[PDB]
Amino acid sequence: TIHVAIVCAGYNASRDVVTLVKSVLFHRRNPLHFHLIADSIAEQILATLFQTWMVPAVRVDFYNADELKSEVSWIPNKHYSGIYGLMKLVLTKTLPANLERVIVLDTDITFATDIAELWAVFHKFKGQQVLGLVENQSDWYLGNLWKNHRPWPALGRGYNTGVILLLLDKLRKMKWEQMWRLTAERELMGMLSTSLADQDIFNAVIKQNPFLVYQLPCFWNVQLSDHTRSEQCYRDVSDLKVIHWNSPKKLRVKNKHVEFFRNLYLTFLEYDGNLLRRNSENLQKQLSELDEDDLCYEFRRERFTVHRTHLYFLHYEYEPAADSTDVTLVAQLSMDRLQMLEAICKHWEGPISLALYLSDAEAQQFLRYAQGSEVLMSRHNVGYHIVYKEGQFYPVNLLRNVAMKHISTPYMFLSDIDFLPMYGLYEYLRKSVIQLDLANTKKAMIVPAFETLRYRLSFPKSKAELLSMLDMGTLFTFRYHVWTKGHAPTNFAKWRTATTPYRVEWEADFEPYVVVRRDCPEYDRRFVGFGWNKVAHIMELDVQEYEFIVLPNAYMIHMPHAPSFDITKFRSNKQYRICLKTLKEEFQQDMSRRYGFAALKYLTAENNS
Amino acid sequence: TIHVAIVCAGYNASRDVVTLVKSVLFHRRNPLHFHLIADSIAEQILATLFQTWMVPAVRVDFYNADELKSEVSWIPNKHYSGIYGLMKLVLTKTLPANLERVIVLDTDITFATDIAELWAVFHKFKGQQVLGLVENQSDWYLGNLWKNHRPWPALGRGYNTGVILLLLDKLRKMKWEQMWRLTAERELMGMLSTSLADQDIFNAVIKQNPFLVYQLPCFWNVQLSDHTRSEQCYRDVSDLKVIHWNSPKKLRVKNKHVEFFRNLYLTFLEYDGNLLRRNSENLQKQLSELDEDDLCYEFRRERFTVHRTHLYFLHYEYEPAADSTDVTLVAQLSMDRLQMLEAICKHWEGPISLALYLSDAEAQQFLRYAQGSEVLMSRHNVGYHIVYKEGQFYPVNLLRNVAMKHISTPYMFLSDIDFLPMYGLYEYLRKSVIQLDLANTKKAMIVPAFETLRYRLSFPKSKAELLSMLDMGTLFTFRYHVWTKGHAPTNFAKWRTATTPYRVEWEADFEPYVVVRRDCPEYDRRFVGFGWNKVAHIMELDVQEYEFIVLPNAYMIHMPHAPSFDITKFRSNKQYRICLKTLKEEFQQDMSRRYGFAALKYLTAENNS
Ligand SMILES: [Mn+2]
Ligand SMILES: [Mn+2]
Ligand SMILES: [Mn+2]
Ligand SMILES: [Mn+2]
């Protein structure tokens, strides 16, 4: 068995840990056991990520850091990592005595070869040589990079904490705790604070006792920074196994042959991690009896699938409000449709949770785009949950549920990414929510839907101006030429004169856009793709005696968009339609079973139609 | 320096060898040397690809098959591959005498492990074991699959020729040609023909002399068919090394673990080959003097960038006519503008080209979709030249010139997929070219630009009705609200009353759509993206004393389309605009130097404006 421990904190390092994990997994032979010293947010994200990865012969265990933040709090730090840099100092207190030797990797490492070869070095230590480390490739500790430099004392050039190799389960038998605490206290009275966090103190702990360390080969930790001489430490491609990026620039580091290093960085990150799979047994014995001859075999197989979800891709933050009535949009988006994102961002003020569906490479494409555009960065309160690509269908309900569950306000709005709201729709929905008093009853609010057929139009301001455009003829009701029954029962002719909200019942194929509490039912997953992805939720919410209210002054208007293959596959072959109807009626019978007489209504409708 | 031999024949093989070479190259660790025996179309396709791939430490040599077709012409065959399967036995004559041992692989093979391990088996041959094969994993040769089956004689279950391991040196030495020829005729005297082409003759020469074979372990090629028995021939993922998909259904087969095998197949069919990249010296030295402190170094970096081109993705066939006055379109496009292709297919009748610009995964999705639509499939004579993505900019000029160079008719028509000229325009332009007789003079024909914003517009048919709908004014001159000088200088006013074509000189920012002979100049690579792209061609075309002729009776209807990302960057990035201006100055002075006084006019215009 190979064991390893990584400190994780912040969204950036959570991403670094995912890249490191795929790099390591590329060359595995043996079972692996990780230990992530993580805070609350990173733990929440990575638990789900690793629970959905389904990797065999891997066990991942997370150790809280908030409780153990105080252990090093007395040591001031200036490293960009923060207080979490010193967390590499108290692993013995966290990791139980059950283990004997364990790797320790910083989040930025990217393994180029098998980690078993590194694990091999745990039988090459002599006598009291317990700690494994590699010599720093810079001249930071030598005190000669620039005038008036006073680095912490160390032996020779100093050693870098990129890769730590522990062993003997001796650090407890030798009382490491007291000595390191005493060393740290002694090395803080003269100078101000640490410079490299753990790497700053460990070097001193090496100097005061030179014989614990085992001076590994330099070409083990090929540090990449502005003052590296690794060209002596590396000769060819095969002379390279593990690379570090010990600069805040990271991707913007400069070297003589940095091109090959950038290649070696994108060689693992680009890999589609869904091909690394060579809570489970349940999935196998449900997939086992899926009849291939069944007309819905592909759908049945797809429904049970689990896809790699990476919650909170970019930095997120939200200060809760006392009104406890805030709403948050939900949308499903793909890389064929991301251009109008900014349009939507400028038209929403409250928190919004999306759910992307990307393919690794494209995922990164989106990363570069978002890191370029200033509009997304100016806004800190937008989530990004990317459920990576897998299979051939479009599990839209999956992504909608993923955006549903992780939401920081009690209320939510269901819509599509192709639409667009007014200026201040957030505020009006807050007022309407606080007025209709949905805190107790199970009621829903509906925002009417329209569409337009001209790319470059101005954005209306008021209701009168809107109805002016409508009768001018540039706008119509949503789906007024393909699926008329979707919104026709709203009979906007009635709404035009409306001044207070009014309630409506359900009509055939009646698919509005709802604002609802966080307890609303999850979308039924058997249906994936395009078509009948919303109406099922509507009939679910209706059989549960949820009333509908249609807001008089709110509206939302569709922006033209090109078609995708989902609608084409919805119009291609009759088998897809037959399977769709099959699942429809299946849902009706089972829904009746769980509720009964109330469901007969819908059944009668199909008899009438 | 492993040596491989692949038979290529037909467009399907041309597209399978890409995935096979991808698979082999993914796990490479030592230099490789291919030998592709191909006909004219496959030779051109594969020559063009590798030459563009720029893979290092890999050598590729192509051997003609037309000259060597006759060798096996006397052997009737029934395999779907064709007569090229039998050609697998003439390799001794075709391959050079300086080689010793070669791995002969069919197109369908996929390598799960490095071919170095397979090559290593050439250190385990003893006695007179000169061939290397594996036992067939089917019951074809056993004569028991069904009633009235008479397989050719073989040793036991038989052998599958998917993978052949040879020792050229010997087979030459010990008289291989004559004995396989003698066996070939000896086994064809009684009955009609073979059942598996080369897989039959090899089996025959395996049976007659059992001392040449070497019974490799079963797991060197896991044959998958409708009656496979490979379940006992593997236990885990690691053991598997190579898979043969011997079935006309290919990916539609059914097996116990067909899902995992299909996932592996899709792993490399969708892998990003632009990562696999790890003529060269010259490109590097051009990149040498490039300065990163320059105003527009990004443009210089992109000017000579080489992109992977896979010409003629799908079947293509076209017989030139005796008139020698045909015209073919050219137009760039990507994902976002695919659906228009059908409309143009319903408009044009003769051959077209399109420099489709997508990644690998998007290319595969397009392949499936185009294999779905009946209209696309039924049209044989439409090329599809695909250039994969790399870098950040949009090398529109590169796409258009890749479409330019490879055209199978004398004259050509330059446009974008954003236009949809009339119905029957093919014969009209044929007669126009015939009558104006460009075959001798140097002239450029022009068809009418325009623009509309009505997606559901009945398609016009005749000039007078356009006169009417301009009188009522449904659609306006193309780009009448952003760039008036783009097409207003054509003075559409006089077009209406004209009945014969009229000639026009050059004006500022005149960017029409032209028809011209193949000889027309290539584009300047310096301009990549949107903006000041076609005017370069128009000015260069004009200075070569090409008379601009405007056809009286033709016309085009711009189909409204969504905004792209390049235009957004151009409108947002001022540095882009300034770099456009400096590129214009550079091009103007290069124009001056390469032609002299005649090009001063542009400079004067730049001074006047
Ligand atoms: Mn670091
Ligand atoms: Mn739509
Ligand atoms: Mn085959
Ligand atoms: Mn356009």
mmCIF file of N, CA and C in Angstrom, chain B residues 399-487:
data_model
loop_
_atom_site.group_PDB
_atom_site.id
_atom_site.type_symbol
_atom_site.label_atom_id
_atom_site.label_comp_id
_atom_site.label_asym_id
_atom_site.label_seq_id
_atom_site.Cartn_x
_atom_site.Cartn_y
_atom_site.Cartn_z
ATOM 1 N N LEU B 399 -7.640 28.458 -43.165
ATOM 2 C CA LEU B 399 -8.739 27.585 -43.565
ATOM 3 C C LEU B 399 -9.103 27.787 -45.025
ATOM 4 N N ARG B 400 -9.167 29.044 -45.462
ATOM 5 C CA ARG B 400 -9.671 29.293 -46.803
ATOM 6 C C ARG B 400 -8.647 28.820 -47.820
ATOM 7 N N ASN B 401 -7.358 28.999 -47.525
ATOM 8 C CA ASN B 401 -6.350 28.521 -48.461
ATOM 9 C C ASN B 401 -6.171 27.005 -48.434
ATOM 10 N N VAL B 402 -6.429 26.337 -47.304
ATOM 11 C CA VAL B 402 -6.426 24.874 -47.334
ATOM 12 C C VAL B 402 -7.546 24.387 -48.238
ATOM 13 N N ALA B 403 -8.703 25.049 -48.172
ATOM 14 C CA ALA B 403 -9.774 24.715 -49.105
ATOM 15 C C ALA B 403 -9.412 25.106 -50.536
ATOM 16 N N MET B 404 -8.635 26.176 -50.703
ATOM 17 C CA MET B 404 -8.261 26.650 -52.031
ATOM 18 C C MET B 404 -7.363 25.656 -52.754
ATOM 19 N N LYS B 405 -6.288 25.217 -52.097
ATOM 20 C CA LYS B 405 -5.262 24.457 -52.807
ATOM 21 C C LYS B 405 -5.814 23.159 -53.387
ATOM 22 N N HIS B 406 -6.630 22.440 -52.620
ATOM 23 C CA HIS B 406 -7.168 21.147 -53.045
ATOM 24 C C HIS B 406 -8.585 21.289 -53.592
ATOM 25 N N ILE B 407 -8.682 21.535 -54.892
ATOM 26 C CA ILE B 407 -9.956 21.684 -55.583
ATOM 27 C C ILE B 407 -9.833 20.941 -56.905
ATOM 28 N N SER B 408 -10.880 20.202 -57.271
ATOM 29 C CA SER B 408 -10.834 19.289 -58.403
ATOM 30 C C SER B 408 -11.520 19.860 -59.638
ATOM 31 N N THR B 409 -11.616 21.180 -59.735
ATOM 32 C CA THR B 409 -12.171 21.863 -60.892
ATOM 33 C C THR B 409 -11.357 23.124 -61.143
ATOM 34 N N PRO B 410 -11.387 23.669 -62.383
ATOM 35 C CA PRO B 410 -10.477 24.782 -62.700
ATOM 36 C C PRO B 410 -10.799 26.061 -61.943
ATOM 37 N N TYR B 411 -12.058 26.486 -61.978
ATOM 38 C CA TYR B 411 -12.475 27.745 -61.379
ATOM 39 C C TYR B 411 -13.138 27.502 -60.026
ATOM 40 N N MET B 412 -13.341 28.589 -59.282
ATOM 41 C CA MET B 412 -13.768 28.481 -57.896
ATOM 42 C C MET B 412 -14.522 29.744 -57.495
ATOM 43 N N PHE B 413 -15.329 29.609 -56.440
ATOM 44 C CA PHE B 413 -16.207 30.664 -55.942
ATOM 45 C C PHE B 413 -15.898 30.856 -54.460
ATOM 46 N N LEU B 414 -15.564 32.086 -54.070
ATOM 47 C CA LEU B 414 -15.180 32.417 -52.700
ATOM 48 C C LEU B 414 -16.332 33.063 -51.938
ATOM 49 N N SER B 415 -16.648 32.516 -50.763
ATOM 50 C CA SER B 415 -17.747 33.033 -49.950
ATOM 51 C C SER B 415 -17.582 32.619 -48.488
ATOM 52 N N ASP B 416 -18.653 32.813 -47.712
ATOM 53 C CA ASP B 416 -18.824 32.297 -46.359
ATOM 54 C C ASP B 416 -20.065 31.407 -46.280
ATOM 55 N N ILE B 417 -20.195 30.596 -45.230
ATOM 56 C CA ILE B 417 -21.392 29.707 -45.225
ATOM 57 C C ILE B 417 -22.582 30.571 -44.782
ATOM 58 N N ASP B 418 -22.406 31.904 -44.727
ATOM 59 C CA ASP B 418 -23.482 32.783 -44.228
ATOM 60 C C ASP B 418 -24.297 33.279 -45.398
ATOM 61 N N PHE B 419 -24.179 32.659 -46.560
ATOM 62 C CA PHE B 419 -24.894 33.169 -47.747
ATOM 63 C C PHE B 419 -25.598 32.007 -48.380
ATOM 64 N N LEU B 420 -26.523 32.267 -49.279
ATOM 65 C CA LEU B 420 -27.284 31.127 -49.828
ATOM 66 C C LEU B 420 -27.768 31.513 -51.198
ATOM 67 N N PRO B 421 -26.891 31.688 -52.183
ATOM 68 C CA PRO B 421 -27.342 32.198 -53.447
ATOM 69 C C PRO B 421 -28.552 31.445 -53.991
ATOM 70 N N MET B 422 -29.165 31.959 -55.044
ATOM 71 C CA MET B 422 -30.378 31.379 -55.673
ATOM 72 C C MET B 422 -30.391 29.874 -55.931
ATOM 73 N N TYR B 423 -31.490 29.333 -56.458
ATOM 74 C CA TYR B 423 -31.692 27.946 -56.863
ATOM 75 C C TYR B 423 -31.386 27.857 -58.353
ATOM 76 N N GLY B 424 -30.518 26.920 -58.726
ATOM 77 C CA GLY B 424 -30.071 26.792 -60.099
ATOM 78 C C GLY B 424 -28.932 27.700 -60.509
ATOM 79 N N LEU B 425 -28.269 28.361 -59.555
ATOM 80 C CA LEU B 425 -27.157 29.260 -59.862
ATOM 81 C C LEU B 425 -25.975 28.540 -60.493
ATOM 82 N N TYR B 426 -25.874 27.226 -60.301
ATOM 83 C CA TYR B 426 -24.774 26.457 -60.869
ATOM 84 C C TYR B 426 -24.726 26.563 -62.391
ATOM 85 N N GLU B 427 -25.829 26.235 -63.067
ATOM 86 C CA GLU B 427 -25.830 26.318 -64.526
ATOM 87 C C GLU B 427 -25.670 27.758 -64.999
ATOM 88 N N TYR B 428 -26.246 28.709 -64.261
ATOM 89 C CA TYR B 428 -26.129 30.113 -64.640
ATOM 90 C C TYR B 428 -24.669 30.548 -64.654
ATOM 91 N N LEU B 429 -23.927 30.221 -63.590
ATOM 92 C CA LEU B 429 -22.516 30.586 -63.549
ATOM 93 C C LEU B 429 -21.696 29.789 -64.555
ATOM 94 N N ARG B 430 -22.080 28.539 -64.828
ATOM 95 C CA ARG B 430 -21.439 27.788 -65.906
ATOM 96 C C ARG B 430 -21.523 28.553 -67.222
ATOM 97 N N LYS B 431 -22.738 28.956 -67.602
ATOM 98 C CA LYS B 431 -22.917 29.687 -68.852
ATOM 99 C C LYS B 431 -22.204 31.032 -68.807
ATOM 100 N N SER B 432 -22.188 31.683 -67.641
ATOM 101 C CA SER B 432 -21.523 32.979 -67.529
ATOM 102 C C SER B 432 -20.027 32.844 -67.781
ATOM 103 N N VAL B 433 -19.406 31.823 -67.182
ATOM 104 C CA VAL B 433 -17.980 31.579 -67.380
ATOM 105 C C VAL B 433 -17.706 31.223 -68.834
ATOM 106 N N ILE B 434 -18.574 30.404 -69.433
ATOM 107 C CA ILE B 434 -18.386 30.017 -70.831
ATOM 108 C C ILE B 434 -18.439 31.245 -71.732
ATOM 109 N N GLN B 435 -19.430 32.110 -71.516
ATOM 110 C CA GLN B 435 -19.639 33.249 -72.403
ATOM 111 C C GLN B 435 -18.555 34.307 -72.232
ATOM 112 N N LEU B 436 -18.241 34.679 -70.988
ATOM 113 C CA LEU B 436 -17.214 35.693 -70.775
ATOM 114 C C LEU B 436 -15.818 35.183 -71.132
ATOM 115 N N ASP B 437 -15.644 33.866 -71.284
ATOM 116 C CA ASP B 437 -14.395 33.272 -71.768
ATOM 117 C C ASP B 437 -13.180 33.711 -70.944
ATOM 118 N N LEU B 438 -13.132 33.316 -69.682
ATOM 119 C CA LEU B 438 -11.931 33.759 -68.942
ATOM 120 C C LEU B 438 -10.761 32.844 -69.316
ATOM 121 N N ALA B 439 -11.032 31.648 -69.862
ATOM 122 C CA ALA B 439 -9.926 30.733 -70.133
ATOM 123 C C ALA B 439 -8.712 31.421 -70.746
ATOM 124 N N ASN B 440 -8.888 32.577 -71.380
ATOM 125 C CA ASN B 440 -7.773 33.304 -71.971
ATOM 126 C C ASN B 440 -7.378 34.538 -71.177
ATOM 127 N N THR B 441 -8.329 35.424 -70.898
ATOM 128 C CA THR B 441 -8.018 36.681 -70.242
ATOM 129 C C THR B 441 -7.937 36.482 -68.730
ATOM 130 N N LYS B 442 -7.710 37.579 -68.015
ATOM 131 C CA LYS B 442 -7.630 37.583 -66.560
ATOM 132 C C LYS B 442 -8.742 38.492 -66.053
ATOM 133 N N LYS B 443 -9.755 37.904 -65.420
ATOM 134 C CA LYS B 443 -10.933 38.657 -65.018
ATOM 135 C C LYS B 443 -11.540 38.009 -63.785
ATOM 136 N N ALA B 444 -12.316 38.803 -63.053
ATOM 137 C CA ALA B 444 -13.011 38.354 -61.855
ATOM 138 C C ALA B 444 -14.482 38.712 -61.973
ATOM 139 N N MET B 445 -15.310 37.671 -61.744
ATOM 140 C CA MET B 445 -16.782 37.802 -61.796
ATOM 141 C C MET B 445 -17.279 38.095 -60.379
ATOM 142 N N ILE B 446 -18.393 38.826 -60.233
ATOM 143 C CA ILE B 446 -18.932 39.193 -58.886
ATOM 144 C C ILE B 446 -20.422 38.883 -58.827
ATOM 145 N N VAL B 447 -20.864 38.255 -57.738
ATOM 146 C CA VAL B 447 -22.311 37.954 -57.539
ATOM 147 C C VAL B 447 -22.821 38.939 -56.484
ATOM 148 N N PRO B 448 -24.135 39.274 -56.431
ATOM 149 C CA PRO B 448 -24.611 40.332 -55.533
ATOM 150 C C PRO B 448 -24.667 40.116 -54.017
ATOM 151 N N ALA B 449 -23.975 40.970 -53.255
ATOM 152 C CA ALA B 449 -24.075 40.925 -51.774
ATOM 153 C C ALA B 449 -25.466 41.433 -51.339
ATOM 154 N N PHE B 450 -25.869 41.236 -50.072
ATOM 155 C CA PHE B 450 -27.204 41.671 -49.596
ATOM 156 C C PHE B 450 -27.359 41.329 -48.125
ATOM 157 N N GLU B 451 -28.535 41.565 -47.527
ATOM 158 C CA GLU B 451 -28.755 41.109 -46.115
ATOM 159 C C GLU B 451 -30.247 41.126 -45.718
ATOM 160 N N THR B 452 -30.718 40.118 -44.957
ATOM 161 C CA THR B 452 -32.138 40.043 -44.482
ATOM 162 C C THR B 452 -32.188 39.678 -42.989
ATOM 163 N N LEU B 453 -33.304 39.953 -42.298
ATOM 164 C CA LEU B 453 -33.475 39.596 -40.893
ATOM 165 C C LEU B 453 -34.766 38.817 -40.641
ATOM 166 N N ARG B 454 -35.313 38.156 -41.657
ATOM 167 C CA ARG B 454 -36.524 37.335 -41.557
ATOM 168 C C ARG B 454 -36.218 35.845 -41.686
ATOM 169 N N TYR B 455 -36.122 35.129 -40.559
ATOM 170 C CA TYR B 455 -35.713 33.726 -40.637
ATOM 171 C C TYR B 455 -36.677 32.912 -41.492
ATOM 172 N N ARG B 456 -37.981 33.123 -41.315
ATOM 173 C CA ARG B 456 -38.983 32.439 -42.132
ATOM 174 C C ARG B 456 -39.454 33.340 -43.275
ATOM 175 N N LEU B 457 -38.577 33.479 -44.266
ATOM 176 C CA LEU B 457 -38.833 34.244 -45.481
ATOM 177 C C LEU B 457 -39.009 33.270 -46.638
ATOM 178 N N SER B 458 -40.091 33.408 -47.407
ATOM 179 C CA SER B 458 -40.190 32.555 -48.582
ATOM 180 C C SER B 458 -39.020 32.881 -49.502
ATOM 181 N N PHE B 459 -38.336 31.847 -49.961
ATOM 182 C CA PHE B 459 -37.120 32.027 -50.747
ATOM 183 C C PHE B 459 -37.439 32.624 -52.114
ATOM 184 N N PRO B 460 -36.932 33.820 -52.453
ATOM 185 C CA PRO B 460 -37.159 34.375 -53.798
ATOM 186 C C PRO B 460 -36.712 33.451 -54.923
ATOM 187 N N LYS B 461 -37.198 33.710 -56.139
ATOM 188 C CA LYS B 461 -36.955 32.849 -57.290
ATOM 189 C C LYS B 461 -36.470 33.625 -58.514
ATOM 190 N N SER B 462 -36.915 34.878 -58.671
ATOM 191 C CA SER B 462 -36.686 35.638 -59.896
ATOM 192 C C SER B 462 -36.382 37.101 -59.590
ATOM 193 N N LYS B 463 -35.584 37.712 -60.468
ATOM 194 C CA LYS B 463 -35.099 39.080 -60.275
ATOM 195 C C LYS B 463 -36.206 40.112 -60.020
ATOM 196 N N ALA B 464 -37.281 40.088 -60.822
ATOM 197 C CA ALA B 464 -38.364 41.060 -60.638
ATOM 198 C C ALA B 464 -38.988 41.015 -59.246
ATOM 199 N N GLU B 465 -39.083 39.838 -58.630
ATOM 200 C CA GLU B 465 -39.687 39.796 -57.304
ATOM 201 C C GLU B 465 -38.749 40.410 -56.274
ATOM 202 N N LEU B 466 -37.436 40.282 -56.485
ATOM 203 C CA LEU B 466 -36.488 41.038 -55.676
ATOM 204 C C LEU B 466 -36.668 42.536 -55.885
ATOM 205 N N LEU B 467 -36.866 42.972 -57.132
ATOM 206 C CA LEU B 467 -37.190 44.381 -57.353
ATOM 207 C C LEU B 467 -38.381 44.792 -56.495
ATOM 208 N N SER B 468 -39.397 43.926 -56.430
ATOM 209 C CA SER B 468 -40.592 44.227 -55.644
ATOM 210 C C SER B 468 -40.250 44.318 -54.162
ATOM 211 N N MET B 469 -39.542 43.317 -53.630
ATOM 212 C CA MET B 469 -39.380 43.250 -52.184
ATOM 213 C C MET B 469 -38.359 44.262 -51.693
ATOM 214 N N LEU B 470 -37.519 44.790 -52.587
ATOM 215 C CA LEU B 470 -36.727 45.976 -52.278
ATOM 216 C C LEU B 470 -37.592 47.229 -52.314
ATOM 217 N N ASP B 471 -38.525 47.300 -53.271
ATOM 218 C CA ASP B 471 -39.483 48.402 -53.297
ATOM 219 C C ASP B 471 -40.256 48.494 -51.986
ATOM 220 N N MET B 472 -40.712 47.354 -51.470
ATOM 221 C CA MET B 472 -41.263 47.286 -50.121
ATOM 222 C C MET B 472 -40.178 47.179 -49.058
ATOM 223 N N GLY B 473 -38.982 46.749 -49.446
ATOM 224 C CA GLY B 473 -37.794 46.793 -48.616
ATOM 225 C C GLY B 473 -37.842 45.864 -47.422
ATOM 226 N N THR B 474 -37.852 44.558 -47.698
ATOM 227 C CA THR B 474 -37.753 43.571 -46.632
ATOM 228 C C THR B 474 -36.304 43.397 -46.198
ATOM 229 N N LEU B 475 -35.382 43.468 -47.156
ATOM 230 C CA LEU B 475 -33.962 43.274 -46.921
ATOM 231 C C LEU B 475 -33.168 44.391 -47.583
ATOM 232 N N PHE B 476 -31.990 44.661 -47.034
ATOM 233 C CA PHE B 476 -31.212 45.844 -47.367
ATOM 234 C C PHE B 476 -29.837 45.430 -47.876
ATOM 235 N N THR B 477 -29.072 46.416 -48.340
ATOM 236 C CA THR B 477 -27.714 46.144 -48.788
ATOM 237 C C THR B 477 -26.899 45.581 -47.630
ATOM 238 N N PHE B 478 -26.083 44.571 -47.929
ATOM 239 C CA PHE B 478 -25.340 43.862 -46.893
ATOM 240 C C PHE B 478 -24.498 44.835 -46.076
ATOM 241 N N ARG B 479 -24.647 44.761 -44.750
ATOM 242 C CA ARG B 479 -23.883 45.582 -43.806
ATOM 243 C C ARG B 479 -24.083 47.072 -44.085
ATOM 244 N N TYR B 480 -25.350 47.482 -44.129
ATOM 245 C CA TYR B 480 -25.713 48.863 -44.422
ATOM 246 C C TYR B 480 -25.673 49.770 -43.201
ATOM 247 N N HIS B 481 -25.530 49.216 -41.996
ATOM 248 C CA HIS B 481 -25.556 50.011 -40.777
ATOM 249 C C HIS B 481 -24.254 50.007 -39.989
ATOM 250 N N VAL B 482 -23.262 49.209 -40.381
ATOM 251 C CA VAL B 482 -21.980 49.140 -39.688
ATOM 252 C C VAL B 482 -20.842 49.626 -40.578
ATOM 253 N N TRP B 483 -20.753 49.094 -41.797
ATOM 254 C CA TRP B 483 -19.675 49.396 -42.737
ATOM 255 C C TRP B 483 -20.355 49.731 -44.060
ATOM 256 N N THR B 484 -20.708 51.005 -44.246
ATOM 257 C CA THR B 484 -21.355 51.408 -45.490
ATOM 258 C C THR B 484 -20.436 51.203 -46.688
ATOM 259 N N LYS B 485 -19.144 51.489 -46.530
ATOM 260 C CA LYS B 485 -18.223 51.365 -47.653
ATOM 261 C C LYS B 485 -17.976 49.920 -48.064
ATOM 262 N N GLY B 486 -18.460 48.943 -47.294
ATOM 263 C CA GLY B 486 -18.220 47.553 -47.650
ATOM 264 C C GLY B 486 -18.839 47.158 -48.978
ATOM 265 N N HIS B 487 -20.107 47.519 -49.189
ATOM 266 C CA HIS B 487 -20.766 47.170 -50.444
ATOM 267 C C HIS B 487 -21.574 48.282 -51.097
#
